Amino acid sequence: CPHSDTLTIDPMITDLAGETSRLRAAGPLTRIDLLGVPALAVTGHTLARQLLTDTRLVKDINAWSLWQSGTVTRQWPLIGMIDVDRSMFTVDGPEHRRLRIKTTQALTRRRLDALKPTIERYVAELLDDLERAGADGAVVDLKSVFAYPLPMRVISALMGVPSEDQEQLLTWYKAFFSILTPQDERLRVIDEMHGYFTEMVRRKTAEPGDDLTSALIYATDGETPLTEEEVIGNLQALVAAGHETTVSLILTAVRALLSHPEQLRLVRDGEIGWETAIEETLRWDGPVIHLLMRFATEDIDLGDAVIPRGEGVVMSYRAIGRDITVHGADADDFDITRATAARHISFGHGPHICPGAALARLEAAIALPALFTRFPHLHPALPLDQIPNLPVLTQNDLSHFPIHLGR
């Protein structure tokens, strides 16, 4: 690996540990290459926090010099991560709060109390599936049987996605996220997803129900109402995020606890909270690797560095979770007892901070203890260190997770 001043992010995710350490070492601001496209990566905790609140960094792709010049187009395999419709995800400034408010109100801890029974029912159902799958000592994929379906069920219940449509959504997302999907097919899948959620919003407009989509469509009376584009945009964002991140969180938490059985014991015996184990998982091995992307509306002076107007800026959240300045020398270790376990920014910071953090945390806090209580001798049927990532550049997406129920 001969010295380079640009760090190429390997889209096959062949050396995530090496790559994450190289980003930390090269940071807190360093040049990266995303499939032939240059950007800056923010890899330090403090600098990330400053920049995530800097109003000169915007989501709007039309602020991107390479987009303005036509240098980057829809042929770029990562383009679907940023060139999306109007929503809380793409907006900044005073307009942004309007696009967030119904969702944040709906996803408060207290409002989520009402969704808890549903989450509990789905966890119980999928554990029944695990039991069936793992009978007579057979090897089971913890991902396909338990972790992969659960968050789709949950976010679907919340948004009003029919039971019978969820399999198709998962199929689309898998194609959408895989770097291997041919770009023409990925763009088709993106159109097909948009068509689906467009019709879903038309369905809920004609016949509203007790779900968040209906609430985005029909606001309290006072308004002003969200456009069709905004409702669909929020909808797609909530489902995509709600599913994809949460799967990873469940799987990494299990892998972390199973490879650190002494720390699994701490949570089982009630000496450390499950919630604390989940925070350290978010810090150490969290759902987001990189977040695309922000752009400078003008020059941003950082004292001994300048991010030029038009430049693309990525938040390298995995690298950021391994910040030694913040977490100490053992940042690269999983340690649910560390003082800084909950001091991560793995859900972001500033205006665009994750609105679903309480739901993510709640799903994990129900699912994890339920899994280990039900199957106390759960163990890997494959060395945990041999579980590969899927080729998904921006997301910490585990391929499969072979276990035995034990015993």
Ligand X SMILES: CC(=O)[C@H]1CC[C@H]2[C@@H]3CCC4=CC(=O)CC[C@]4(C)[C@H]3CC[C@]12C
Binding residues for Mg(2+), by number, are 3, 5
User: Can you tell me which residue has the tokens 């009003």?
Assistant: 160
* Cβ proximity to ligand HEM, 30 vs 87, nearer residue: 87
Q: Is 262 in the site for Mg ion (CB under 5 A)?
A: no
The residue at minimum Cβ distance from Mg ion is 5
Q: Can you tell me the distance from the alpha carbon of 287 to that of 281, in angstroms, rounded to the nearest whole number?
A: 9
Going by the DSSP 8-state scheme, the letter that residue 174 receives in this structure is: H
Binding mask 133-162 vs ligand X (x if CB under 6 A, - otherwise)? ------------------------------
Please, which residues bridge with residue 312 across strands?
295
Closest C-alpha among 401, 356, 365, 376 to residue 278: 365
By rule CB under 5 A, what count of residues binds Mg ion?
1
Q: Is 237 in the site for ligand X (CB under 6 A)?
A: yes
User: Can you tell me which residue has the tokens 């998904």?
Assistant: 392
Tally the C-alpha atoms within 13 A of residue 366's C-alpha that lie toward its C-beta. 25
Conformational region of residue 222, where left means phi above 0, alpha means psi within -120 to 50, and beta covers everything else: left
What are the φ and ψ backbone dihedral angles of 281, each rounded to 5 degrees?
-60, -40
Are 350 and 53 contacting, i.e. CB atoms less than 8 angstroms apart?
yes
Q: Is 88 in the site for ligand HEM (CB under 6 A)?
A: yes
Q: Which residues are annotated as a binding site for heme b?
A: 96, 100, 294, 317, 352, 354
* Cβ proximity to ligand HEM, 66 vs 152, nearer residue: 152
Both structure tokens of 189 = 């899948």
Closest C-alpha among 120, 7, 23 to residue 321: 23
Both structure tokens of 259 = 């490879």
64, 173, 347, 375: residue in contact with ligand HEM (rule CB under 6 A)? 347
23, 79, 84, 264: residue in contact with ligand X (rule CB under 6 A)? 84
Q: Can you tell me the distance from the alpha carbon of 8 to that of 23, in angstroms, rounded to the nearest whole number?
A: 10
Q: Which residues are annotated as a binding site?
A: 3, 5, 96, 100, 294, 317, 352, 354
* Cβ proximity to ligand X, 44 vs 287, nearer residue: 287
Query: Cα torsion at 330, 332, 333, 336 (round to 10°)?
Result: 90
Is residue 114 packed enough to be buried (19+ CB in 10 Å), middle (13-18) or exposed (0-12)? exposed
* Cβ proximity to ligand HEM, 232 vs 405, nearer residue: 232
- Return the range that interacts with Mg ion (CB under 5 A); candidates 3-11, 151-159, 169-177, 247-255: 3-11
Q: Can you tell me the distance from the alpha carbon of 57 to that of 387, in angstroms, rounded to the nearest whole number?
A: 36
Type of residue found at 366: I
Q: Show the CA angle centred on residue 264, arms to residues 260 and 269, nearest 5°.
A: 150
Give me the least distance between CB of 291 and ligand X, in Å please: 5
23, 32, 253, 291: residue in contact with ligand X (rule CB under 6 A)? 291
Q: Is 81 in the site for ligand HEM (CB under 6 A)?
A: no
Instruction: Give the chain's length.
Output: 407
23, 47, 57, 81: residue in contact with ligand X (rule CB under 6 A)? 81
Give me the least distance between CB of 20 and ligand HEM, in Å please: 15
Q: Is 352 in the site for ligand HEM (CB under 6 A)?
A: yes
Look at strands 29-34 and 7-8 and give their pairing: parallel
* Cβ proximity to ligand HEM, 114 vs 329, nearer residue: 114
* Cβ proximity to ligand HEM, 336 vs 359, nearer residue: 359
Q: Which of residues 4-33 bind Mg ion (CB under 5 A)?
A: 5
Q: Is 246 in the site for ligand HEM (CB under 6 A)?
A: yes
Contact positions vs ligand HEM (CB under 6 A): 88-89, 100, 155, 237-238, 241-242, 245-246, 249, 286-288, 291, 315, 317, 346-348, 352, 354-356, 359-360
Residues contributing to the site for ligand X (CB under 6 A) = 80-81, 84, 89, 236-237, 240-241, 244-245, 287-288, 291, 395
- Which residues sit at the interface with Mg ion, rule CB under 5 A? 5
